[PDB]
Amino acid sequence: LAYSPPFYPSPWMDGNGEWAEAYRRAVDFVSQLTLAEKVNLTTGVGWMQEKCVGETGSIPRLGFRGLCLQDSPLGVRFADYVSAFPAGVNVAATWDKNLAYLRGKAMGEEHRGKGVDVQLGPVAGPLGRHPDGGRNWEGFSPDPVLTGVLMAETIKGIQDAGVIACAKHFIGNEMEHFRQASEAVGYGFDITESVSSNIDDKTLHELYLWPFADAVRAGVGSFMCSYNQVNNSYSCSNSYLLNKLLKSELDFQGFVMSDWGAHHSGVGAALAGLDMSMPGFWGTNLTIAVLNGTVPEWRVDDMAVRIMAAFYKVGRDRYQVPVNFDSWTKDEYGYEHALVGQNYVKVNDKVDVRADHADIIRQIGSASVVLLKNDGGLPLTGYEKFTGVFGEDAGSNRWGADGCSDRGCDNGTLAMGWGSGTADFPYLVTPEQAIQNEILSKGKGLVSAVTDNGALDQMEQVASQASVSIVFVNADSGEGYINVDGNEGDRKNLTLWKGGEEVIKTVAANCNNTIVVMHTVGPVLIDEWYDNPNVTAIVWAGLPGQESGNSLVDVLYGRVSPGGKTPFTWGKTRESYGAPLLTKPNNGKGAPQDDFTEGVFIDYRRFDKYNETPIYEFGFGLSYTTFEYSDIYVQPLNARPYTPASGSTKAAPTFPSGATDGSPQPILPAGGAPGGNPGLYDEMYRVSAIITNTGNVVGDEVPQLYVSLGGPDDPKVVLRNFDRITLHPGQQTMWTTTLTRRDISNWDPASQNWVVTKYPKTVYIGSSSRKLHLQAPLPPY
Amino acid sequence: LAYSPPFYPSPWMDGNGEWAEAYRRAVDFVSQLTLAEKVNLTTGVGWMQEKCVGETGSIPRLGFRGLCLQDSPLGVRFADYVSAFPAGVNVAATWDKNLAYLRGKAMGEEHRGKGVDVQLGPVAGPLGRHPDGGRNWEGFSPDPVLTGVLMAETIKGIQDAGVIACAKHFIGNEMEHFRQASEAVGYGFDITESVSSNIDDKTLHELYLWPFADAVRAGVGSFMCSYNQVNNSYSCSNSYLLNKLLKSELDFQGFVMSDWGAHHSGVGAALAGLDMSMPGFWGTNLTIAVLNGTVPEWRVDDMAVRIMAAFYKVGRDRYQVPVNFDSWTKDEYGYEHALVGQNYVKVNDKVDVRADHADIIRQIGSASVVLLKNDGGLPLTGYEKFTGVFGEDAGSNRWGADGCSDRGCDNGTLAMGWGSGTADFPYLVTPEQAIQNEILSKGKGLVSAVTDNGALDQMEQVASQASVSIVFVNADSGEGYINVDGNEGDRKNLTLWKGGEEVIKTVAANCNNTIVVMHTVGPVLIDEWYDNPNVTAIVWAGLPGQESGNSLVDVLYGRVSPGGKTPFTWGKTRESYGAPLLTKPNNGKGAPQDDFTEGVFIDYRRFDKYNETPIYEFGFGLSYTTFEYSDIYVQPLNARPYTPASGSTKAAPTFPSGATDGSPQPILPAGGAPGGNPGLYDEMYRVSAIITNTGNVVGDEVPQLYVSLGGPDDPKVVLRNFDRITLHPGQQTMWTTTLTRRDISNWDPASQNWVVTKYPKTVYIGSSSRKLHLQAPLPPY
Amino acid sequence: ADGCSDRGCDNGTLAMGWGSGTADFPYLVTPEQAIQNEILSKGKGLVSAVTDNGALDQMEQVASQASVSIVFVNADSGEGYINVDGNEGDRKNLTLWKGGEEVIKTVAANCNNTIVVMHTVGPVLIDEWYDNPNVTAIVWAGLPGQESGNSLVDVLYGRVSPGGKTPFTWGKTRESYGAPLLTKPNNGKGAPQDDFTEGVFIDYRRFDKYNETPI
């Protein structure tokens, strides 16, 4: 069985650089506390005991209320008068740092307005190892660079708004199956331990860890360790994960909380790098552990100062307001127990925090539309003589937009997946609604919407008469505690839901101008219809949130040229992506064993390795205009030689082998600063090229920079940079980026550091992972 | 708030009388044990941690395995190759002590064959305060005497078969709403404590406690304390309930276990009279409590000896075999964790324990059929030209007989309610099947079954052609953790399910020979159709178990004359019964307060008090013959005057004020032996009457003896005795019974004893609570 | 049993097709009834009937425990004036109705002694499951009328040795049988022209001519 080596002691904050101010204030505060008050900060109050999804204990003596931790990565969960933003996968499809930032800011503002201290997001774990992973849509992309950059931008947005962000789930939670034993038992599996993700040191560094490094370096205040095990040690008590990788190598200065009820070795977890136990036994044991000397004073002191450092870093001291909503009821008032009797208190103030956020939600919606096919289908005018609209995915949730708890259904148009990664729609504009509005405001031609996928007679009837037929199909997934139609979080197949395929086939048989719109959490198998000549255009629109219908028609009717690029591969078969989900226990009653044998070869890397042609490759997307690439240039920057980190920490302040050692510790070679050794981010080359709009309308292009690292075990190409640029007809721009040392390095387990290998590297600039228009050598030096 | 006075110390065993052999052996065994081993007997192993619904810790040092505790009151829950017996309410409808005993024996045999040590049943709580109480069907009758008698017979049957019986639930668990806070929260209620049943001392003694007294006197080995509070103290740590009423007044010698996760004050519960914590912290705390002196050594010794006494009393030492099934899977084999790695062990031996138990199931089915109306409808011959069968309740569960987990649905014929009070059908004979068999083996007339309650066109079609139309309707309920169609355990109304009333109305409109069969957990409202002249007969058949169809047709086609009497009242309205369920919290976030303000006036007592005429009164049932009552005679027996119990207990042996007092204790005036002061069971009068069969077929009569206690706050009549008697045409019998002192006494709170008041008492013998054919004074002495 | 006019449905056990070629059942003995009668009159072992083709979980649950699993599938057709599920008299395909194929596959995956009973108006395509080793027997019972259940169990339980022979061919594909039904007009608004170009080569004559091996 795979084994996770120990690493102790648990690193304490250094509070260097951009954390110095926050460290100073945290020390000043924690210095004043008793042991009990310190432990209060690390202790969850219990499941559903207060107002927020999680809360810490209070310190009333100083007028410090418990921290409020609230879902989700795409909005304020449970609360009323909030916005429902597009999912993370949509953000990925924008390839737009700026939009990612603005979404973070808007979300952060909403959390702030409700009195939330910590937003439980964003997500880089799952990364997206499997196409059928249940929660991938909450994250960004299987690509570590695209995910990492947008993760970082999102975090900066949330935290600039004055709310602590939380990078989750750390790490290796690439599927929902067997994430928690209790949950697995509920689905009829006999296991007593969570699945072990078995991941080697190189795969972690070059794939799954990379975006979390970006999150650390972006100044993220907190981390959440995952339900699963890594190398047969639960994440929340995995010393290699938290102590070595996170707090030494990546030099994370913030605090680590557990996922809710995530299994850890109790007090032992604190020694292994856990700082906060959620949702809440731990408190009194940690107290006793300190008193009897199993847990050092310096450790609890560091747990407290990490929590308070995050608090001060984002300016909670300035922006905190009372929690003015309740997660567990919409009632205005409720009862609370007191020392004697009960108090009737106000619990929901109905504070409207939505502001103008509908604008950015509509914008990201439109920006996340990916045009996959266009044989003269798009754009539409609104002066079509007869528009047919087809599919339940065009219509309303008959139970109300928020009629399914945690969005745990596929009623009507899909604009959000299910589970904890949700928020309530203040309203939801359907495609049916937006399209009828478009028509009735313009040409006022005929329009009919058949939103029952079983009504194939009517679809035939209407499609036979249509100038254009707009077909809507979806595929849903989410968190493992919800099972929809045999999908236990993870998708049981890559098929369109509710007979979407038959809808497409029926409509295309009767209308030679059929447009297909896919709202899917990830890829589906489209091989049987995508190349149908009656299908004149195909778009993926993902999970667009409250403005779905409006953001879509903006694109379909040509107000916005589609400029999204698919953030994952569209393969011919499920086998194209690699091995199935592990959905059958393979270690008897023990932890299922999930070997990440493919290494870095997930999504497009896999397709590239096996020389398999995807239907639509990673980074592919069409436009209403054309773009031309020319004149690549590589400028060596003659960076200083990489220096491994050296020296030692200071001794652990007070305000298992090594677990209680508070003496100065050696700095790891690849460590030294948040996100790793600073030399890793030295700029090595400047690469530039000219992009021109050679067509007849304004549009966005996503130029992409790929690197061939050149080794026998390296992917043919890996994404290293990208931007989204608006170009008017005949407009040119110089696209210029830099490659860092990290960008051209490989992880070396032997030396425990990033190395630039001797193999010749090649840089490519193109419009997709396969459309590599330009290339040049990276000259060694 | 209602208050529960303390009563300490927790009484230790006497081990006199029927318990002497058991106590001696229990002492000998426990004398050999360490503290840890003693505590192990009191500790559950944890939810789903072994094979049985509950298991105690083991004493491997003496090769003594953990006890196996298994549901249910009507069979062996979860296990394969077992029988599904008729529900307790059907037993009540038989009014047949012998049948109650034989059912207990058959159930005990099946538990025994599976290796079960404790059968978690039978049920006298709920008694049946509300007609819409979800779990009433698990018990017997709202009448305490009918329930007490049949409860005792059931217990004797189980324990004679060599299994420990468990009287549950003690006490006041008369509805499912708010029984457990976690469950209430799941239904959207904000409470942190279970409902409090607020019951006065007199009401407890004269109603709810009465059948439990019978259980004690019958020698039941164990009790289960309930989820709810009584006078704002959880049953499982209610010292008044457990120490005073159960273990002092009723002098119970066996052990008390908690309901599964029933709240109690931990170590405090032990001092208040709890002996066993299920399903299982307690072990550690109890060990610590003994070492530090907070729990006396004599208490833990008493806990252990009570458990072992129950074990020896029924002869578990003789009859114990290994547990040969698994509650949690039907798989033959399963992996188990070892010291090193894992083992693959046999978990299910598929031991067939059904024997010939199908016979007693068919018999009790037939005996529990109550004929409520017959204007020339029944019996049938099987030579009818055209038989129509109508209603989903005639047909099959389309998901298989065991297709709904815990029977949590109303698919097809209703033969069992839902929740823990269940067992898997080995097969299920439906009315549809049995009726078609009857016809096709006899006259071979036409027969059609319309088993879709929505297919009213077809019902008209068939009914208008039929010689006879047999209509099937049901109403279901169960434990609160299952919600079927908005019925949160408790019934949301007293309507027939699935449009049953419309089925009846449709068929009766088209067929002037309509027979209605009701399979209901309790009463439903029948005011709109019972008196329809086209309805020529009505039967209630309840929940008959696996032989439903066969037991029914035996009655319908005249092989068995119906002899059951309804064990509850059929009122015109819900309001007829009294006040609604408490289904809305009335103490803010605290324990809802459920005041039993009606006192002893439930079911027929309420109807009698308020002069509400029932449609069908308690104790009412028809026959295929007729019976005549004559010649009542009362013989005073000149019993010894009642002596209040006095004297002391032994000092507590070793092997809150007064909680640690192990000194001799005063015997309570109404205590002194199991079931109460033995003088209470002195026979005061002998009463006889003559019953004659004046009709033309053999049949059973259930003569009933009622007493008027004569006070202004006494019920007009209370049941005190009954029998079921077979009489051939023209045959007479002298029915002779005795009234005990208890039978003619009232509970006096001031003196804490049963008293015979000076109010004149009358005895009645008749065929129902309303059909009081004979009466005589009870002359005082 | 007679709940659908002219038997114009596929509710429950199929013992008669639809249209004018019908009569009213005086009663209908189902396989469910006959099999339960057989067991409860003999060994009195366990018996359960899952008769909802969508209840696949329950089918796995029960098939897992069974000594023998007896699976019932059907396919219906009739006169043109009745349309059932898009079958305008003629069958729109040769598939088992109501997901019968998925019933077979589910049961066979959980029980290595699965018996399949087919009540079909004619051949269906069985290529995907007939050769499944967990399917230990296959019978065609057709449309047996009022005694369906009883006539079946007489054979299943060995009172009568089966001696019937299939009166039509079971092919691998629909194409095996030759050209499709003419289901769209080919003479404008006038009489559709249905040319019997295959001549005498229908059913087994066709298979033999083109050297196609029947199942």
Ligand SMILES: OC[C@H]1NC[C@H](O)[C@@H](O)[C@@H]1O
């Ligand atoms: O709801 C709280 C918590 N539940 C568990 C989920 O895995 C996590 O993402 C979420 O934040």
Ligand SMILES: OC[C@H]1NC[C@H](O)[C@@H](O)[C@@H]1O
């Ligand atoms: O299933 C065990 C236990 N659960 C709770 C029920 O109230 C009780 O009757 C049953 O015995």
Ligand SMILES: [Mg+2]
């Ligand atoms: Mg609250």
Ligand SMILES: [Mg+2]
């Ligand atoms: Mg804003």
Ligand SMILES: [Mg+2]
């Ligand atoms: Mg550091």
Ligand SMILES: [Mg+2]
């Ligand atoms: Mg087990």
Ligand SMILES: [Mg+2]
């Ligand atoms: Mg027997």
Ligand SMILES: [Mg+2]
């Ligand atoms: Mg005593």
